[PDB]
Ligand binder design. Sequence first.
Ligand SMILES: CCCCCCCCO[C@@H]1O[C@H](CO)[C@@H](O)[C@H](O)[C@H]1O
Length: 339
Amino acid sequence: ERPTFYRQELNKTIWEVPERYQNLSPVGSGAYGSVCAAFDTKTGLRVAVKKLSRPFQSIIHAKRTYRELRLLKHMKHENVIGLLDVFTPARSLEEFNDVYLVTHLMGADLNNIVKCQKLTDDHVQFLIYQILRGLKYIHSADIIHRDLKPSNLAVNEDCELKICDFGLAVATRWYRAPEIMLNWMHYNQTVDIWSVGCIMAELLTGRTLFPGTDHIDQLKLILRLVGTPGAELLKKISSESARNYIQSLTQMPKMNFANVFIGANPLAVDLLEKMLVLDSDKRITAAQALAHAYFAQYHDPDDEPVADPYDQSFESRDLLIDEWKSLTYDEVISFVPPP
Ligand SMILES: CCCCCCCCO[C@@H]1O[C@H](CO)[C@@H](O)[C@H](O)[C@H]1O
């Protein structure tokens, strides 16, 4: 039943992994934990193996460990990072102290693609299509990503793409929706559509759309493009101080995006106009965007699947270290690899 493990001292720690994984080599350390590239001798795939850092050091670490494992076990979609394997060298709950995750090693991210390469329109369509397809799936599980940016988009050779998080793929601020920088505290899923808009603009032009030096500059750059809030939007702002400030602003009109994205496909410009709207209620959804004529060559309504509902009820629970550890052990033990 149980595999044979082998011991190895790497970044600065012991790696104990099943002997099916060969030729470990470090590719990234820090707040994620710690990650090695490896060859999965069973499947002939290159994989990434992540050893979680200090997984059960405190209540908060332990709950984070649980959260990450639960999320990754749920995602079963071609355009979202998934779990190939999860294991521990421990034989029982009493000795359970280390957790390793195994995912595909896609060989790069969209940062590396963006300015080593000037993208054709067909290839922009393909990249954004795959983002939106993965996002439809994530949103259907009632999950919001909140941090979509090029370094969270893994890409291989053929520019097949997966949405990532937890380090498994310069400034994050550049892709954030305005309402996050205003500390809104209720978010629509379409915060993620704003970020897609920013990413798409950049694939088209080869430049960051809103390269703010800080959150205030970032907002200034955004308003110059989309204009200052209209009355219809102002009706939905409950914060007195935010209304006051916005009202102090000298009004500016929406720019016509055709004048900004010069020479882009007219359909891409249209789609951009529908993503980069200040009012989150009026942004196109991932589902609706898939059907936009810009993606006519890739869209198939019968092959854009949705997710099973994801039980987030644990986020509201306050438990002990050993309880979060036990729940995590349960999830390791119940793991079933994909085909
Ligand atoms: C500088 C002005 C920035 C205004 C940002 C406007 C965000 C508008 O989007 C708002 O998002 C909220 C939360 O997702 C929703 O509850 C509101 O109904 C919606 O209007």
